[PDB]
Structure 1
Amino acid sequence: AADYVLYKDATKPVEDRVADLLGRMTLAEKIGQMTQIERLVATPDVLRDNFIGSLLSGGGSVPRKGATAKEWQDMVDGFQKACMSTRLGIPMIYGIDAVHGQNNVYGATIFPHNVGLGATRDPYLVKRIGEATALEVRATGIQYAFAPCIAVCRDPRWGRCYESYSEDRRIVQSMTELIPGLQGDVPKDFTSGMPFVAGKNKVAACAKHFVGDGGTVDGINENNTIINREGLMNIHMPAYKNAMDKGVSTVMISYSSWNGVKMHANQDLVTGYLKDTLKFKGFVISDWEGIDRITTPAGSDYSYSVKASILAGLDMIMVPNKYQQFISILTGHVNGGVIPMSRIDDAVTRILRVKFTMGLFENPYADPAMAEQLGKQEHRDLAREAARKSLVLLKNGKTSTDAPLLPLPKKAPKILVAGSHADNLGYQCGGWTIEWQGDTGRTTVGTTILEAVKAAVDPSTVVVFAENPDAEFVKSGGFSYAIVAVGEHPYTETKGDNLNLTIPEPGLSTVQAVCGGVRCATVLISGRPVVVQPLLAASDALVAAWLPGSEGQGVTDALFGDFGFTGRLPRTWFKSVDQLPMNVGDAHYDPLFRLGYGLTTNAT
């Protein structure tokens, strides 16, 4: 046609489309592509006027409580209509933390957190979870998931240990299969470091947080990782190469420092290593107010934050609120020659490369036929499989000569289900579920451990629930056995940092009351190893269930012997927090349970 514009031609090669569009852009259009804002500060005028490149939902940033998939699609499409109305019509990309399913959304399947996935040693399971997650994210109109976290947690006092598959880099490397699940498999020909997304039923992925987020002193979140280059490259870096080989579209930078250098200011690692050595050609995104946190106190020199980060090689800044100040400062740095146009053009080349590659110019709007993928039963069946595979049986009898307690019989006259975590969907999902920090009670659609027991047992079995029964209640109750579930409360990021790793009361006291009256199976809900000798001493059987998500029937599938226990510890279980850090090759390696430990059962 006479009004032909090459970048708008879907038959043209991505690199030609990128260069064609880049060549038309003004500095304001270029800096707008580099800007990611919260939906909370977005309006149609803001998105058009500042040529915004991306939006996100932070944890709990939702159009309303209980919103349907269509409500999400209508919100995202509203923002997109504004972006498509700009002079160049560059669609925005919408990101979200879909880190164990599409976890901010009511009715989304919630998969086990990464630590329990590590326990499965099943990369294909994790790929299938990426596939199901992409469908439930696209059900809501969202095109970009901030996952996987390929942190290698080296100290369980870290609040984000549950977001790491393992302390063993080799397990983390294996679980990079989430990437082709979320994005699609890369073709035969594929060049390591290029971005890839198969099309409108897949999402852009994000390898995070580059690099050494799991290596910080005493597990302090966002703090310093003190390790020589050989150890950074041997432990923290390897899974990023697997991510490049699988075509991960984006990389998010860590709040943490390496030997005192902020990652958000580290040109040698972000440009010298990730871009120039690993040949990454997708886009690099900040963390949330990550450039503000380059300084002490955070946000005390935002002009320096902007200069340091953009010169380090970051492409897109998760501002996410003060966009006027970000755009203004960056524009002033370019106008002043402090940041060269070559750097702006690289950042925009990478952002557009991802957008064109993933088909976002061809399919900028949501597909209403995808809405019904949210919470689909096949995905729940997958989450139930994953939860069951994640369980690690730590004890199954007090002595070598006792009858094994597990598997339990489905037919018994009366059984007890007890503990703070037995009937609390929010607790079994943990952080990053509906709210940022997670929450308590019936926050979404799912099955608690109590509901799963009631669904599993013979009709003649009477199930009694008591959250915190006393010893006499148990001894007088006529119970065959008890299932008692206790553990950690939900947490995220620095709220989770914990130097004592002792579960909250009344958990141990409830286990001791229950188990002292009747044979008991203790189900421990945690993001990590926690002080466990007292729980073990009380219990006939004890299962580390991690944070198994919405499908509590995965727990009962192994308790009642439909399947055998197969999970193995993906991290060391410490005897004492004074040991830490303590990893599977140090001089003082003296675990309660070594990495890889796990008892088994046979299906009944």
Structure 2
Amino acid sequence: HHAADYVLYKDATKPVEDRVADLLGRMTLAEKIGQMTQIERLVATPDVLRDNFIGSLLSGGGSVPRKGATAKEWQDMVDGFQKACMSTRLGIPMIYGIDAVHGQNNVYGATIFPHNVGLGATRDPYLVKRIGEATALEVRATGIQYAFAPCIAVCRDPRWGACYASYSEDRRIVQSMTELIPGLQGDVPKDFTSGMPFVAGKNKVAACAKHFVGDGGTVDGINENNTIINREGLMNIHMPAYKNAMDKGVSTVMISYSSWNGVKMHANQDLVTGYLKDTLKFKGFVISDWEGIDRITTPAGSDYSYSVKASILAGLDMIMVPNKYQQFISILTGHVNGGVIPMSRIDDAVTRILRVKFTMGLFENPYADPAMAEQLGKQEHRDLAREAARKSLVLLKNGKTSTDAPLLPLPKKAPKILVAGSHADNLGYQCGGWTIEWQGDTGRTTVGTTILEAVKAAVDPSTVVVFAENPDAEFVKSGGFSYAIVAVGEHPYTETKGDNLNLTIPEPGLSTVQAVCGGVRCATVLISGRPVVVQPLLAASDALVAAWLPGSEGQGVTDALFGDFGFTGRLPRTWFKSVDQLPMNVGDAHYDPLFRLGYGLTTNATK
């Protein structure tokens, strides 16, 4: 189509499938295996990226150009990697992925949205779509084109350390919240074939439905473990939202560390190829989890040759290595050279990877847009996060007896009030895991508003606000306080570090609530990624709110405490009476909840 040096795959006017086929037909085995290889930025250099024809890079949790890096520092880092990839013989751009799972959360100054369990409490799919839209903009502000979200796990046991990453124990709620996908990617057109990948253009990102499949169903909630359930239960609980993700054009799917009835998902040809590809007609790319193929074996990494053969034959397309790319590339090249892995399997993996890259516009816009930098932490997105935080709150108690005056909403004008607890003025605790660091962190780790700061912003100027982190009973009784707001709960965690068989909050938390509430009427705000043992907190408190992990916008909590809005959140999970009941789900013979799925008290906005 015209100029003497015309190359069809470089022609932006050609159909995607024609561009894929034209490029694939020109590639060497080294160029094909390179596309299937994703590496950490920590091991990337210009020569590594060119010499190994690398297809993708990622930042793991906390993998950043430096602490406090600006949006432009991120764009310059990503573009430097891209310039190296674009300089190869074929000039195939790399795709850069990151865990943007509640905002662009590794990045300083990014808006931090509530974690998924609180979003499930909102029952508001359109809110979650808007959160996807804002998240795409803040990810593109940093030059990154690919977000590893949504987690569509259906967490069936809150002892799991990733329960907060699940919208709900009820698959129907998880299905509803797949609206995150067209938020991040853009809406698919009217014509659209389920299972095809879609991203609208340079202001959107590729999404990732994860982790396929049954990651929320593991024995005792043990992370990365075995999910024991018949096919009927797998298909009835854990699978449905993957079909909604196909219908919405999700570009990629990430495989689970978990096993299904003893078969590693990373080695499961029947599910990855037979079901996801051949039954659901998924045409995007399938990516491993981090060292996911290493973990097929016990011990992990003890037969990496088998890990590569089993995973690639199972149908995985792109491997998140993420460090030992030389070994990965060498073993896979040997398997192909030996006839153990057919060329047809390599060509399928590369076809899918290229299909996603051409579809999303990456060959047309491989570099960052400096004009997008200011999207990072934009006030409109903070207002959205504040809306979501407020909608996520579930009021569990509002008065000790049926005849007491309800404590909430609290008055903004009072002579003197107390704000207390470990979680009242700790931005890292209110954001939880996957915030700045992989495991999250403590204190003022990014830009945001703590519960204490939100209270000071909300109250009448005549209201004196006193903060004490862990006051004793006498300090409270002598203080002349009108009421107290006391915030306690879990410390930040992610995945295995969060697996927890007792689900009791760290001390001092309960002791502080008891000291405070013993001296003055108190509203307890519980920060957690899941239900935790709650009867002692309830017995002490006049009012108690499950605020989950509400993110950077602490004013969402005070918006409801002071009656600017009514409480509307409803439990997206069962609240247990004791951990010895677990697992305990609706329909079980022993279903005996402290609070059932859907429970939530309400208030009306103050007049």
The two structures have a TM-score, normalised by structure 1, of 1.00
Shift of 1:329: 0.2
Residue aligning to 2:568? 566
Shift of 1:239: 0.1
> CA deviation digits over 1:36-57, x for unaligned, max 9?
0000000000000000000000
**1:296 and 2:298 matched:** yes
Shift of 1:257: 0.1
> CA deviation digits over 1:2-34, x for unaligned, max 9?
000000000000000000000000000000000
Q: Indicate the SS of the match to 1:280.
A: coil
Q: Indicate the SS of the match to 1:202.
A: coil
Aligned residue pairs: how many? 604
CA–CA distance in structure 1, aligned partners of residues 369 and 306 of structure 2: 42
CA–CA distance in structure 2, aligned partners of residues 568 and 190 of structure 1: 34
Q: Indicate the SS of the match to 2:602.
A: coil
Shift of 1:585: 1.4
CA–CA distance in structure 2, aligned partners of residues 413 and 224 of structure 1: 56
> CA deviation digits over 1:243-286, x for unaligned, max 9?
00000000000000000000000000000000000000000000
CA–CA distance in structure 2, aligned partners of residues 161 and 493 of structure 1: 8
> CA deviation digits over 1:54-105, x for unaligned, max 9?
0000000000000000000000000000000000000000000000000000
Q: Indicate the SS of the match to 1:561.
A: coil
> CA deviation digits over 1:398-434, x for unaligned, max 9?
0000000000000000000000000000000000000
Q: 184, 198, 202: which one pairs with 1:196?
A: 198
CA–CA distance in structure 2, aligned partners of residues 469 and 39 of structure 1: 46
Shift of 1:584: 1.5
Residue aligning to 2:64? 62
CA–CA distance in structure 1, aligned partners of residues 468 and 43 of structure 2: 45
**1:525 and 2:496 matched:** no
> CA deviation digits over 1:205-232, x for unaligned, max 9?
0000000000000000000000000000
Q: Indicate the SS of the match to 1:516.
A: helix
CA–CA distance in structure 2, aligned partners of residues 585 and 188 of structure 1: 38
CA–CA distance in structure 2, aligned partners of residues 557 and 71 of structure 1: 35
> CA deviation digits over 1:506-563, x for unaligned, max 9?
0000000000000000000000000000000000000000000000000000000000
Shift of 1:603: 0.1
> CA deviation digits over 1:337-375, x for unaligned, max 9?
000000000000000000000000000000000000000
Residue aligning to 2:485? 483
CA–CA distance in structure 2, aligned partners of residues 376 and 520 of structure 1: 34
Q: Which runs of 5+ in 1 are unaligned?
A: none
Q: 495, 498, 503: which one pairs with 2:497?
A: 495
Q: Which runs of 5+ in 2 are unaligned?
A: none
> CA deviation digits over 1:117-175, x for unaligned, max 9?
00000000000000000000000000000000000000000000000000000000000
Residue aligning to 1:105? 107
Structure 1: which 4+ aligned runs deviate by more than 2 Å?
none
The two structures, once aligned, show a CA RMSD in angstroms of 0.2
CA–CA distance in structure 2, aligned partners of residues 431 and 298 of structure 1: 25
CA–CA distance in structure 1, aligned partners of residues 59 and 423 of structure 2: 29
CA–CA distance in structure 2, aligned partners of residues 234 and 206 of structure 1: 21
Q: 253, 265, 273: which one pairs with 2:267?
A: 265
Q: Indicate the SS of the match to 1:233.
A: helix
CA–CA distance in structure 2, aligned partners of residues 470 and 328 of structure 1: 64
Shift of 1:310: 0.1
Residue aligning to 1:448? 450
Q: Percent identity?
A: 100
Residue aligning to 2:423? 421
Residue aligning to 2:314? 312
CA–CA distance in structure 2, aligned partners of residues 290 and 518 of structure 1: 52
CA–CA distance in structure 1, aligned partners of residues 469 and 86 of structure 2: 53
Shift of 1:238: 0.1
> CA deviation digits over 1:281-327, x for unaligned, max 9?
00000000000000000000000000000000000000000000000
> CA deviation digits over 1:444-495, x for unaligned, max 9?
0000000000000000000000000000000000000000000000000100
Q: Indicate the SS of the match to 2:501.
A: coil
